[PDB]
Amino acid sequence: CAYRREIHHAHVAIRDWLAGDSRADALDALMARFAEDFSMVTPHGVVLDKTALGELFRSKGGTRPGLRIEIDGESLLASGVDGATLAYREIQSDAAGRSERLSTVVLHRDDEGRLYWRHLQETFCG
Numbered sequence: 001c002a003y004r005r006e007i008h009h010a011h012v013a014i015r016d017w018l019a020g021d022s023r024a025d026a027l028d029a030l031m032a033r034f035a036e037d038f039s040m041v042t043p044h045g046v047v048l049d050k051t052a053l054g055e056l057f058r059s060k061g062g063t064r065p066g067l068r069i070e071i072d073g074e075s076l077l078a079s080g081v082d083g084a085t086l087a088y089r090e091i092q093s094d095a096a097g098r099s100e101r102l103s104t105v106v107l108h109r110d111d112e113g114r115l116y117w118r119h120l121q122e123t124f125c126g
Helices: 002-019 026-031 050-060
Strands: 034-041 047-049 068-080 083-094 097-109 115-124
Touching: 002 026, 002 050, 002 068, 002 083, 002 097, 002 115, 026 050, 034 050, 047 050, 083 115
Parallel strands: 034 115
Antiparallel strands: 034 047, 068 083, 083 097, 097 115
16 A cells, blocks of 8 residues: 555665665665654653654765665554554664664655654664
8 A cells, every 4th residue: 555655665775774785865865754733652661753754864864884674564544534643663784783663653644645754762682
């Protein structure tokens, strides 16, 4: 579905950016997926707004060569005319190692079907 697709495509863009295999003007296009009022809770229990996430991604561009990101365990928790809330699992692996986290995302949709990230919370596993 469109929601599952957005979760996957966003992470492919994130992976390419972190690995240094991104398209031209990649970061702006990536940050455009996030709503103005986006907020997230990282696995460290730290809160980041859109501006803060953008600064973080800027500093991390190309820092994880060969990075691979796997998304699975997607579950539609709620959905309506304004969007949906879903849960999923994210696995990251590179030379430095592998990490697993569980996430909850709130996606906002406009009438043209376009999706924007409104909220994201992640929790480390293992």
